[PDB]
Short mmCIF file of C-alpha atoms and ligand atoms in Angstrom, two decimals:
data_model
loop_
_atom_site.label_atom_id
_atom_site.label_comp_id
_atom_site.label_asym_id
_atom_site.label_seq_id
_atom_site.Cartn_x
_atom_site.Cartn_y
_atom_site.Cartn_z
CA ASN A 2 10.14 30.72 -19.02
CA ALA A 3 11.66 32.60 -22.12
CA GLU A 4 7.98 32.78 -23.08
CA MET A 5 7.57 34.75 -19.81
CA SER A 6 10.59 37.00 -20.33
CA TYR A 7 9.50 37.94 -23.88
CA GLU A 8 5.92 38.95 -22.99
CA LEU A 9 7.14 40.75 -19.88
CA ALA A 10 9.53 42.87 -21.98
CA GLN A 11 6.72 43.55 -24.49
CA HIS A 12 4.90 45.10 -21.56
CA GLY A 13 7.96 46.95 -20.31
CA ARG A 14 8.54 44.68 -17.25
CA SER A 15 11.32 42.35 -16.08
CA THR A 16 9.38 40.65 -13.27
CA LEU A 17 5.89 39.18 -13.04
CA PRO A 18 3.68 41.85 -11.50
CA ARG A 19 2.33 41.37 -8.03
CA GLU A 20 -1.21 40.92 -9.47
CA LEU A 21 -0.45 37.79 -11.55
CA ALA A 22 0.47 34.26 -10.43
CA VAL A 23 1.21 31.24 -12.60
CA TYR A 24 0.88 27.59 -11.58
CA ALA A 25 1.40 24.46 -13.57
CA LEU A 26 -0.14 21.08 -13.10
CA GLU A 27 2.70 18.57 -13.56
CA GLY A 28 1.61 15.37 -15.21
CA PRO A 29 -1.68 13.65 -15.08
CA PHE A 30 -1.53 12.90 -11.32
CA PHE A 31 -1.30 16.49 -10.23
CA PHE A 32 -3.50 15.74 -7.12
CA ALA A 33 -0.87 16.20 -4.39
CA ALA A 34 0.23 19.53 -6.01
CA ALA A 35 -3.33 20.68 -6.49
CA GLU A 36 -3.89 20.09 -2.75
CA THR A 37 -0.79 22.00 -1.64
CA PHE A 38 -1.44 24.91 -3.94
CA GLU A 39 -5.04 25.14 -2.82
CA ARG A 40 -3.75 25.16 0.79
CA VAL A 41 -1.22 27.90 0.06
CA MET A 42 -3.74 30.12 -1.70
CA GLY A 43 -6.08 29.71 1.28
CA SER A 44 -3.41 30.52 3.90
CA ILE A 45 -1.55 33.46 2.43
CA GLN A 46 -2.60 36.94 3.37
CA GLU A 47 -2.58 38.51 -0.07
CA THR A 48 -3.86 36.90 -3.21
CA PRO A 49 -3.12 37.64 -6.86
CA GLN A 50 -5.83 39.28 -9.10
CA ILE A 51 -5.23 36.63 -11.86
CA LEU A 52 -3.90 33.06 -11.78
CA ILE A 53 -2.82 31.25 -14.96
CA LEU A 54 -3.16 27.54 -14.64
CA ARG A 55 -0.82 25.83 -17.23
CA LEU A 56 -2.09 22.46 -18.47
CA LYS A 57 0.59 21.75 -21.19
CA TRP A 58 2.00 18.87 -19.01
CA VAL A 59 -1.31 17.11 -18.51
CA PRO A 60 -1.70 14.35 -21.07
CA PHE A 61 -5.21 13.20 -20.13
CA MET A 62 -7.74 13.76 -17.31
CA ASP A 63 -10.25 11.36 -15.90
CA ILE A 64 -13.23 12.08 -13.66
CA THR A 65 -10.89 12.14 -10.68
CA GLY A 66 -8.60 14.87 -12.06
CA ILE A 67 -11.65 16.79 -13.40
CA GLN A 68 -13.24 16.93 -9.97
CA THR A 69 -9.88 17.89 -8.42
CA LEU A 70 -9.36 20.69 -10.95
CA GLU A 71 -12.95 21.86 -10.38
CA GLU A 72 -12.55 22.06 -6.56
CA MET A 73 -9.23 23.90 -6.93
CA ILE A 74 -10.73 26.51 -9.23
CA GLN A 75 -13.77 26.89 -6.97
CA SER A 76 -11.42 27.51 -4.06
CA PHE A 77 -9.60 30.31 -6.00
CA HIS A 78 -12.84 31.91 -7.27
CA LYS A 79 -14.15 32.15 -3.80
CA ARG A 80 -11.16 34.43 -2.82
CA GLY A 81 -11.72 36.75 -5.76
CA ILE A 82 -9.07 35.21 -8.09
CA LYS A 83 -9.77 35.16 -11.81
CA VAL A 84 -8.45 31.92 -13.23
CA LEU A 85 -7.17 31.57 -16.78
CA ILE A 86 -6.29 28.20 -18.27
CA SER A 87 -3.63 27.66 -20.98
CA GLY A 88 -2.00 24.87 -22.93
CA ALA A 89 -4.61 22.03 -22.77
CA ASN A 90 -3.80 19.50 -25.54
CA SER A 91 -6.49 18.65 -28.12
CA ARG A 92 -8.05 15.93 -26.06
CA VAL A 93 -7.91 17.54 -22.64
CA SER A 94 -9.33 20.70 -24.40
CA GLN A 95 -12.50 18.66 -25.39
CA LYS A 96 -12.70 17.16 -21.89
CA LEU A 97 -12.54 20.60 -20.25
CA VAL A 98 -15.63 21.68 -22.34
CA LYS A 99 -17.60 18.46 -21.75
CA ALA A 100 -16.88 18.48 -18.01
CA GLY A 101 -17.95 22.08 -17.40
CA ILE A 102 -14.45 23.45 -16.59
CA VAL A 103 -14.69 25.93 -19.47
CA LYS A 104 -18.09 27.06 -18.11
CA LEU A 105 -16.52 27.54 -14.74
CA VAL A 106 -13.73 29.78 -15.78
CA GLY A 107 -15.38 31.42 -18.79
CA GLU A 108 -14.64 30.65 -22.54
CA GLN A 109 -12.87 33.97 -22.89
CA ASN A 110 -10.33 32.87 -20.18
CA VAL A 111 -9.18 29.66 -21.90
CA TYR A 112 -6.07 29.98 -24.18
CA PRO A 113 -4.46 27.50 -26.51
CA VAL A 114 -0.92 28.53 -25.34
CA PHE A 115 0.59 30.13 -22.35
CA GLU A 116 1.95 33.21 -24.10
CA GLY A 117 -1.50 34.30 -25.14
CA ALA A 118 -2.85 33.84 -21.52
CA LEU A 119 0.15 35.82 -20.18
CA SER A 120 -0.33 38.59 -22.78
CA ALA A 121 -4.06 38.80 -21.94
CA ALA A 122 -3.44 38.91 -18.19
CA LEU A 123 -0.74 41.59 -18.37
CA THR A 124 -3.08 43.65 -20.57
CA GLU A 125 -5.99 43.27 -18.11
CA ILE A 126 -3.76 44.22 -15.15
CA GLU A 127 -2.59 47.35 -17.00
CA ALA A 128 -6.17 48.45 -17.72
CA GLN A 129 -7.08 47.79 -14.00
CA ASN G 2 -0.30 7.93 -23.93
CA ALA G 3 -0.23 7.06 -27.76
CA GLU G 4 -1.27 3.65 -26.42
CA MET G 5 -4.34 5.50 -25.05
CA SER G 6 -5.07 7.47 -28.22
CA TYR G 7 -4.90 4.33 -30.41
CA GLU G 8 -7.31 2.21 -28.33
CA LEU G 9 -9.63 5.18 -27.89
CA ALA G 10 -9.86 5.63 -31.68
CA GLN G 11 -10.44 1.87 -32.09
CA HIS G 12 -13.49 2.43 -29.94
CA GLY G 13 -14.53 5.57 -31.78
CA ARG G 14 -13.54 8.00 -28.95
CA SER G 15 -11.04 10.85 -28.57
CA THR G 16 -11.29 11.20 -24.78
CA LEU G 17 -11.28 8.70 -21.91
CA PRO G 18 -14.91 8.06 -21.02
CA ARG G 19 -16.27 9.31 -17.76
CA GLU G 20 -16.53 5.70 -16.47
CA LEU G 21 -12.79 4.88 -16.68
CA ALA G 22 -9.85 6.28 -14.67
CA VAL G 23 -6.18 5.39 -14.98
CA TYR G 24 -3.53 5.78 -12.27
CA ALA G 25 0.09 4.84 -12.29
CA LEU G 26 2.31 3.96 -9.40
CA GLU G 27 5.60 5.78 -10.02
CA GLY G 28 8.62 3.85 -8.87
CA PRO G 29 8.94 1.43 -6.07
CA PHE G 30 8.22 4.00 -3.31
CA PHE G 31 4.79 4.92 -4.54
CA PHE G 32 3.52 5.30 -0.89
CA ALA G 33 2.97 9.07 -0.82
CA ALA G 34 1.09 8.87 -4.18
CA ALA G 35 -0.92 5.87 -3.08
CA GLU G 36 -2.02 7.89 -0.02
CA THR G 37 -3.04 10.97 -2.01
CA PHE G 38 -4.90 9.01 -4.62
CA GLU G 39 -6.73 7.02 -1.99
CA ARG G 40 -7.68 10.36 -0.36
CA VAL G 41 -8.91 11.82 -3.64
CA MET G 42 -11.00 8.78 -4.51
CA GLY G 43 -12.57 8.96 -1.03
CA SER G 44 -13.36 12.69 -1.23
CA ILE G 45 -14.71 13.17 -4.72
CA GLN G 46 -18.42 13.02 -5.28
CA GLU G 47 -18.47 10.80 -8.34
CA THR G 48 -16.32 7.76 -8.86
CA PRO G 49 -15.33 5.93 -12.04
CA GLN G 50 -16.81 2.43 -12.81
CA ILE G 51 -13.28 1.05 -13.61
CA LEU G 52 -9.79 2.08 -12.50
CA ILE G 53 -6.66 0.80 -14.27
CA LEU G 54 -3.70 0.72 -11.98
CA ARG G 55 -0.45 0.78 -14.12
CA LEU G 56 2.49 -1.02 -12.52
CA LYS G 57 5.04 -0.79 -15.44
CA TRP G 58 7.16 1.68 -13.35
CA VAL G 59 7.38 -0.50 -10.27
CA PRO G 60 10.60 -2.49 -10.33
CA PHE G 61 10.05 -4.54 -7.16
CA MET G 62 7.65 -4.60 -4.19
CA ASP G 63 8.33 -5.60 -0.63
CA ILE G 64 5.86 -6.38 2.15
CA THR G 65 5.47 -2.66 2.75
CA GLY G 66 4.41 -1.81 -0.82
CA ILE G 67 2.24 -4.97 -0.95
CA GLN G 68 0.28 -3.93 2.10
CA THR G 69 0.00 -0.37 0.75
CA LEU G 70 -1.28 -1.60 -2.62
CA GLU G 71 -3.71 -3.94 -0.82
CA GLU G 72 -5.19 -1.13 1.35
CA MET G 73 -5.52 1.15 -1.69
CA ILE G 74 -7.40 -1.46 -3.68
CA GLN G 75 -9.62 -2.27 -0.68
CA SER G 76 -10.45 1.41 -0.41
CA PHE G 77 -11.53 1.54 -4.12
CA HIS G 78 -13.52 -1.73 -3.94
CA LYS G 79 -15.48 -0.45 -1.06
CA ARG G 80 -16.80 2.48 -3.25
CA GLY G 81 -17.88 0.14 -6.03
CA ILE G 82 -14.78 0.61 -8.27
CA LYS G 83 -13.57 -2.36 -10.29
CA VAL G 84 -9.79 -2.32 -10.32
CA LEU G 85 -7.71 -3.68 -13.18
CA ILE G 86 -3.94 -4.02 -12.94
CA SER G 87 -1.56 -3.79 -15.93
CA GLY G 88 2.13 -3.85 -16.71
CA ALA G 89 3.64 -5.75 -13.70
CA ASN G 90 7.14 -6.97 -14.69
CA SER G 91 7.94 -10.70 -14.43
CA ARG G 92 8.98 -10.55 -10.83
CA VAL G 93 6.35 -8.20 -9.49
CA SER G 94 3.81 -10.39 -11.44
CA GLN G 95 4.88 -13.46 -9.28
CA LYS G 96 4.78 -11.32 -6.11
CA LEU G 97 1.24 -10.09 -6.87
CA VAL G 98 0.06 -13.79 -7.05
CA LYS G 99 1.95 -14.92 -3.93
CA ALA G 100 0.76 -11.93 -1.90
CA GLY G 101 -2.93 -12.31 -2.72
CA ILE G 102 -3.24 -9.12 -4.85
CA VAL G 103 -4.37 -11.17 -7.86
CA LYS G 104 -7.01 -12.84 -5.64
CA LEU G 105 -8.17 -9.44 -4.55
CA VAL G 106 -8.76 -7.99 -7.93
CA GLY G 107 -9.60 -11.20 -9.80
CA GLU G 108 -7.26 -13.10 -12.29
CA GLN G 109 -9.39 -11.96 -15.19
CA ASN G 110 -8.62 -8.28 -14.29
CA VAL G 111 -4.81 -8.57 -14.43
CA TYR G 112 -3.17 -7.70 -17.83
CA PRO G 113 0.39 -8.04 -19.01
CA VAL G 114 0.25 -4.59 -20.75
CA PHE G 115 -1.75 -1.47 -20.45
CA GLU G 116 -3.29 -1.57 -23.92
CA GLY G 117 -4.99 -4.85 -23.21
CA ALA G 118 -6.42 -3.50 -19.86
CA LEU G 119 -7.63 -0.34 -21.66
CA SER G 120 -9.19 -2.38 -24.49
CA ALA G 121 -10.95 -4.65 -21.97
CA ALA G 122 -12.25 -1.72 -19.91
CA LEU G 123 -13.58 0.23 -22.90
CA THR G 124 -15.31 -2.97 -24.07
CA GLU G 125 -16.90 -3.55 -20.64
CA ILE G 126 -18.09 0.07 -20.44
CA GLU G 127 -19.69 -0.23 -23.89
CA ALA G 128 -21.57 -3.40 -22.90
CA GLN G 129 -22.72 -1.65 -19.63
CA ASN C 2 17.69 -3.37 -9.74
CA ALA C 3 19.91 -5.83 -11.84
CA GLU C 4 21.99 -5.76 -8.65
CA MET C 5 18.84 -7.17 -6.97
CA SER C 6 18.10 -9.78 -9.63
CA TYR C 7 21.69 -11.12 -9.57
CA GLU C 8 21.91 -11.60 -5.78
CA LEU C 9 18.40 -13.04 -5.69
CA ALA C 10 19.38 -15.68 -8.27
CA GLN C 11 22.57 -16.42 -6.31
CA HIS C 12 20.25 -17.32 -3.47
CA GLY C 13 17.88 -19.28 -5.68
CA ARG C 14 15.06 -16.66 -5.62
CA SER C 15 13.30 -14.49 -8.22
CA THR C 16 11.48 -12.20 -5.78
CA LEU C 17 12.55 -10.34 -2.64
CA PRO C 18 11.54 -12.50 0.31
CA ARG C 19 8.77 -11.38 2.57
CA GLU C 20 11.32 -10.76 5.38
CA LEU C 21 13.36 -8.08 3.56
CA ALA C 22 12.39 -4.54 2.52
CA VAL C 23 14.51 -1.97 0.71
CA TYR C 24 14.04 1.81 0.80
CA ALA C 25 16.08 4.53 -0.78
CA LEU C 26 16.50 8.09 0.31
CA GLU C 27 16.27 10.18 -2.86
CA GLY C 28 18.52 13.20 -2.82
CA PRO C 29 19.65 15.26 0.06
CA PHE C 30 16.15 16.54 0.96
CA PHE C 31 14.66 13.15 1.62
CA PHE C 32 12.53 14.58 4.53
CA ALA C 33 9.07 14.25 2.97
CA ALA C 34 9.88 10.62 1.93
CA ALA C 35 11.37 9.80 5.30
CA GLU C 36 8.10 10.99 6.89
CA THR C 37 5.85 8.95 4.61
CA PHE C 38 7.91 5.81 4.94
CA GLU C 39 8.00 6.14 8.69
CA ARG C 40 4.19 6.52 8.60
CA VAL C 41 3.75 3.45 6.40
CA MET C 42 6.00 1.27 8.55
CA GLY C 43 4.00 2.37 11.62
CA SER C 44 0.59 1.67 10.04
CA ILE C 45 1.04 -1.63 8.27
CA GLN C 46 0.13 -4.80 10.06
CA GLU C 47 3.19 -6.86 9.21
CA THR C 48 6.73 -5.61 9.21
CA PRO C 49 9.84 -6.95 7.50
CA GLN C 50 12.65 -8.60 9.60
CA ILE C 51 15.34 -6.47 7.79
CA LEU C 52 15.21 -3.10 6.04
CA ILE C 53 18.03 -1.91 3.77
CA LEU C 54 18.24 1.83 3.64
CA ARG C 55 20.09 2.88 0.39
CA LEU C 56 22.03 6.14 0.70
CA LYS C 57 23.79 6.15 -2.76
CA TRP C 58 21.59 9.15 -3.84
CA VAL C 59 22.38 11.31 -0.84
CA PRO C 60 25.21 13.68 -1.67
CA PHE C 61 25.59 15.33 1.75
CA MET C 62 23.71 15.46 5.07
CA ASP C 63 23.45 18.30 7.52
CA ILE C 64 22.24 18.25 11.11
CA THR C 65 18.67 18.38 9.84
CA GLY C 66 18.93 15.24 7.67
CA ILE C 67 20.98 13.49 10.41
CA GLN C 68 18.26 14.02 12.98
CA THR C 69 15.61 12.95 10.44
CA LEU C 70 17.52 9.77 9.59
CA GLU C 71 18.03 9.09 13.31
CA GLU C 72 14.29 9.42 14.15
CA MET C 73 13.36 7.19 11.18
CA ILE C 74 15.73 4.45 12.26
CA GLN C 75 14.55 4.73 15.88
CA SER C 76 10.99 4.31 14.66
CA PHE C 77 11.92 1.07 12.77
CA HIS C 78 14.00 -0.34 15.66
CA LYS C 79 11.14 0.07 18.00
CA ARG C 80 9.00 -2.34 15.82
CA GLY C 81 11.70 -5.00 15.79
CA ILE C 82 13.19 -4.11 12.35
CA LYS C 83 16.92 -4.54 11.85
CA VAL C 84 18.17 -1.71 9.69
CA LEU C 85 21.13 -2.03 7.34
CA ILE C 86 22.60 0.98 5.55
CA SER C 87 24.34 0.82 2.15
CA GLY C 88 25.93 3.10 -0.41
CA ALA C 89 26.94 6.19 1.68
CA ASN C 90 29.54 8.19 -0.32
CA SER C 91 32.93 8.92 1.30
CA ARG C 92 31.80 12.07 2.99
CA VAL C 93 28.37 10.98 4.16
CA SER C 94 30.15 7.76 5.42
CA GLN C 95 32.33 9.96 7.78
CA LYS C 96 29.26 11.98 8.82
CA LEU C 97 27.30 8.82 9.69
CA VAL C 98 30.15 7.78 12.11
CA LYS C 99 30.59 11.24 13.67
CA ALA C 100 26.83 11.69 14.15
CA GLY C 101 26.23 8.36 15.87
CA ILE C 102 24.18 6.77 13.04
CA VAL C 103 26.70 3.92 12.74
CA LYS C 104 26.41 3.37 16.52
CA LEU C 105 22.68 3.24 16.17
CA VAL C 106 22.51 0.58 13.55
CA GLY C 107 25.70 -1.30 14.42
CA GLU C 108 29.07 -1.18 12.45
CA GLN C 109 28.46 -4.68 11.17
CA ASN C 110 25.21 -3.47 9.46
CA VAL C 111 26.80 -0.70 7.37
CA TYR C 112 27.89 -1.67 3.79
CA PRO C 113 29.82 0.24 1.19
CA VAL C 114 27.46 -0.97 -1.62
CA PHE C 115 23.99 -2.26 -1.88
CA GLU C 116 24.86 -5.70 -3.24
CA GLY C 117 26.85 -6.55 -0.16
CA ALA C 118 23.94 -5.42 2.16
CA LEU C 119 21.48 -7.49 0.05
CA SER C 120 23.79 -10.54 0.11
CA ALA C 121 24.19 -10.23 3.90
CA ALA C 122 20.45 -9.85 4.49
CA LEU C 123 19.46 -12.80 2.30
CA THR C 124 22.07 -14.89 4.13
CA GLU C 125 20.74 -13.85 7.56
CA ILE C 126 17.14 -14.59 6.52
CA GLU C 127 18.16 -18.06 5.31
CA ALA C 128 19.89 -18.87 8.62
CA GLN C 129 16.76 -17.57 10.52
CA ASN Q 2 28.13 19.43 -4.83
CA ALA Q 3 31.80 19.70 -6.20
CA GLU Q 4 31.23 23.36 -5.31
CA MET Q 5 30.75 22.08 -1.73
CA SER Q 6 33.76 19.75 -1.74
CA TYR Q 7 36.10 22.50 -3.03
CA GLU Q 8 35.15 25.14 -0.44
CA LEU Q 9 35.17 22.53 2.32
CA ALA Q 10 38.76 21.56 1.42
CA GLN Q 11 39.74 25.25 1.29
CA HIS Q 12 38.65 25.35 4.91
CA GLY Q 13 40.38 22.09 5.78
CA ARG Q 14 37.14 20.03 6.07
CA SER Q 15 35.66 17.01 4.27
CA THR Q 16 32.15 17.25 5.73
CA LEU Q 17 29.72 20.13 6.24
CA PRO Q 18 30.13 21.28 9.83
CA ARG Q 19 27.37 20.68 12.29
CA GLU Q 20 26.64 24.45 12.39
CA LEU Q 21 25.70 24.83 8.70
CA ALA Q 22 22.71 23.44 6.77
CA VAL Q 23 21.90 23.88 3.09
CA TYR Q 24 18.46 23.61 1.49
CA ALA Q 25 17.39 24.15 -2.06
CA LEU Q 26 14.05 25.21 -3.39
CA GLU Q 27 13.37 22.97 -6.40
CA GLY Q 28 11.51 24.72 -9.16
CA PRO Q 29 9.03 27.48 -8.96
CA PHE Q 30 6.40 25.44 -7.05
CA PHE Q 31 8.58 24.71 -4.07
CA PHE Q 32 5.52 25.02 -1.69
CA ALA Q 33 5.23 21.39 -0.59
CA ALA Q 34 9.02 21.29 0.11
CA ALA Q 35 8.96 24.61 1.89
CA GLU Q 36 6.22 23.19 4.16
CA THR Q 37 8.10 19.98 4.97
CA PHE Q 38 11.36 21.72 5.62
CA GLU Q 39 9.69 24.26 7.85
CA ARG Q 40 8.12 21.31 9.74
CA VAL Q 41 11.45 19.52 10.11
CA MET Q 42 13.27 22.61 11.35
CA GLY Q 43 10.49 23.11 13.93
CA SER Q 44 10.54 19.50 15.16
CA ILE Q 45 14.21 18.66 15.42
CA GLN Q 46 15.95 19.12 18.71
CA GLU Q 47 19.08 20.85 17.48
CA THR Q 48 19.20 23.54 14.86
CA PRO Q 49 22.05 24.76 12.67
CA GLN Q 50 23.63 28.24 13.31
CA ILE Q 51 23.39 29.10 9.54
CA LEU Q 52 21.09 27.89 6.75
CA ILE Q 53 21.88 28.55 3.08
CA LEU Q 54 18.77 28.65 0.99
CA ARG Q 55 19.72 27.93 -2.71
CA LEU Q 56 17.45 29.62 -5.25
CA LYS Q 57 19.34 28.69 -8.51
CA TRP Q 58 16.42 26.34 -9.50
CA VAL Q 59 13.69 28.93 -9.07
CA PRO Q 60 12.91 30.53 -12.41
CA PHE Q 61 10.33 33.07 -11.22
CA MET Q 62 8.32 33.83 -8.06
CA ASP Q 63 4.86 35.26 -7.75
CA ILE Q 64 3.14 36.70 -4.69
CA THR Q 65 2.31 33.18 -3.58
CA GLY Q 66 5.92 31.93 -3.56
CA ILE Q 67 7.09 35.25 -2.03
CA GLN Q 68 4.74 34.88 0.91
CA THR Q 69 5.73 31.21 1.28
CA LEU Q 70 9.43 32.06 1.26
CA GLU Q 71 8.79 34.88 3.75
CA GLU Q 72 6.93 32.61 6.23
CA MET Q 73 9.65 29.94 5.94
CA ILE Q 74 12.41 32.42 6.71
CA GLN Q 75 10.40 33.90 9.59
CA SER Q 76 10.02 30.40 11.01
CA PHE Q 77 13.85 29.84 10.89
CA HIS Q 78 14.67 33.30 12.33
CA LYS Q 79 12.47 32.67 15.26
CA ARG Q 80 14.65 29.61 16.25
CA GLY Q 81 17.86 31.61 16.06
CA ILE Q 82 18.90 30.48 12.53
CA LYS Q 83 20.72 32.98 10.33
CA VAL Q 84 19.51 32.53 6.78
CA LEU Q 85 21.67 33.22 3.74
CA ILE Q 86 20.26 33.19 0.22
CA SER Q 87 22.27 32.27 -2.91
CA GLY Q 88 21.81 31.82 -6.62
CA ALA Q 89 18.69 33.97 -7.40
CA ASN Q 90 18.61 34.65 -11.17
CA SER Q 91 18.51 38.27 -12.39
CA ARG Q 92 14.77 38.55 -12.24
CA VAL Q 93 14.11 36.71 -9.00
CA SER Q 94 17.00 38.86 -7.55
CA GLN Q 95 14.95 42.07 -8.34
CA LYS Q 96 11.78 40.45 -6.95
CA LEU Q 97 13.52 39.51 -3.68
CA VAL Q 98 14.46 43.24 -3.18
CA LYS Q 99 11.04 44.62 -4.15
CA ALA Q 100 9.19 42.10 -1.96
CA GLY Q 101 11.21 42.75 1.19
CA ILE Q 102 12.97 39.33 1.30
CA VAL Q 103 16.39 41.02 1.13
CA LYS Q 104 15.33 43.27 4.04
CA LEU Q 105 14.32 40.22 5.98
CA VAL Q 106 17.54 38.36 5.70
CA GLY Q 107 19.91 41.32 5.44
CA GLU Q 108 21.69 42.57 2.19
CA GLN Q 109 24.99 41.25 3.47
CA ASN Q 110 23.50 37.68 3.56
CA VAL Q 111 22.43 37.54 -0.10
CA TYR Q 112 24.99 36.01 -2.56
CA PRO Q 113 24.98 35.78 -6.32
CA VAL Q 114 26.29 32.15 -6.21
CA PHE Q 115 26.33 29.34 -3.78
CA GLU Q 116 30.10 29.08 -3.42
CA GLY Q 117 30.34 32.59 -2.09
CA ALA Q 118 27.51 31.92 0.49
CA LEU Q 119 29.26 28.67 1.54
CA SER Q 120 32.64 30.42 1.83
CA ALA Q 121 31.09 33.22 3.92
CA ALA Q 122 29.27 30.78 6.22
CA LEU Q 123 32.30 28.57 6.84
CA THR Q 124 34.30 31.72 7.63
CA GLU Q 125 31.65 32.97 10.09
CA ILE Q 126 31.47 29.56 11.80
CA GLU Q 127 35.26 29.52 12.20
CA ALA Q 128 35.29 32.98 13.80
CA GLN Q 129 32.40 31.87 16.15
K1 K Z 201 0.69 21.29 -16.86
K1 K Z 202 3.84 2.12 -12.44
K1 K Z 203 19.74 7.24 -1.60
K1 K Z 204 16.60 26.40 -6.02
#
C-alpha cells in the first residue's frame, strides 16, 4: 500500500513493525485463504500483537462466510492476538454487527478504512 | 453485486438474510473451490435454507466437472440445503440437463440469470 | 472457448462429448492445480477417454514443473486416459522433448494449438 | 519472461537448464503457494542446484510472511538447494536484512532484480 507507506512515515518508520500483521480477505469466497492463514498463525513460533483484517474486497457475506470469519478470529484471539477490522462496505458493516462479529472483536477495534486501523495500531504499539 | 442490492431493496432488505447463501464457481476448473466450499458447509454449525450456485463464469463442463458439481450438490442436499442454480450459458445449460444435474436440483430451481434465482429465493424465505 | 464452439459445430455438436475432458495449466506455478486435478481424476467414478492438457499459459518449466507434469500424466495413464498436449510455446516445446514428456504421451498426441488437439480428439471419439 | 529469454540467449541457451528453477511469491499472502511449493520440492525425486525466489510481487511482509519465507528456505537448504532472492522492493529489502533472511541465504545471493540473479545463476552453473 501507499496508504501503508504514508502512515508508516507519519510514525517515523519505513517497514511494518514486528508487532503488527495485516491480512486481507479477497472476495466473498475467502474460505480457502481463511483456512491457510489460520493454519499459518497456528504453526508459526512468534505471533504479532495486532492483526488488521481488511474487508474492503468482500462485497457480501452469508452465514457461511460469517461463521468462517468468526472461527478465524477465535483462533487468533486464543493466541493473544488483538484483531482489528477495516474497510467493511455499508452492507457488510451492518452484517458484522447483526452477526456478533463486532461484539467479538470490540466496537473500538472496527474502522471504516484501513488507514485509520493502521494509525490506531501503530499508536497502540508505540504506547506498549 | 448491484443485482443483489436491487433485489434486496425490492424485498425491503439491505443485507442477504441469514437463510440464503450464494456461491459462485469461478472458471471451468472450479474443483479446488468446490472442495473447500463443500468442506466449509460440512464443518459449520448452522447452514443456510437455500444456496444459489452461480454458473455464469463456467464456460464449459466435462465429465470431471459434472461429477464434481454432482458430489457438491449431494453434500448440500444431505444437510437439508435447497440448491438453486443460475446463469449457465447455453451449452452448459444443455449439459446440466443431459448429465442429470437438473434432475438433481429440480427443474423449478434452475434459473437463466442470477436475479431471478435471488428473487425466487427471497420470496420462498418470506413465505417460510 | 470460441475455438471449442467452432470445432464442436464442425463435428455437429454443441457440447463437449462425455468422452473428452480439457484441462489447462495456469501459469508456470501450476502445482496446486495439478495436485487438485490429479485428486479429482483419481476420485471420480467415471473417467474421460481423452484429456487435452492446454499448455498455452505456461511460459517456462523447470525440473520441478517437469516432474509435476510427469506424475500427473502418469496418474491419468494408469486409469486408461489418453493424454494429448496442446499449445506449448517454442521453448516449453523443446523442454517437453528433452525431458521425456513427449515420449510419455506419444509424438502423435502433441499439437501446436488447441484447435488441432480438439479436432483430433473429436475425430478419434467418433471412430471409437 | 523476456528477461529470461534475453539472459538465456546471452548464455547460448533457449531453455532454462535442468540445474536452475525459478519461483515467484505472488502478492503479500503467498502462504498457500509457499506451502505447495515446499511440498513439491520435498516430494520430487530430483532437485535443482539453484532456486531463484522472485519477490517483485510482494509489497510488504509481516512476521507471519517472514516466518513462512524462512521455513520455506530452510526446507530447500536442507535438500542441497542454493537459494537466491531477487526483486525485493526498498522496504521488503530492509525487512529481509532485519529479519535474518539475508543471513540465511547469504548477502552475495540477494539481487536487486531478477536478471542479475538469473545471470549469476547461469554463470555459476556453467562453472560447475
Ligand atoms: K478484503
Ligand atoms: K460461475
Ligand atoms: K496453460
Ligand atoms: K513475487
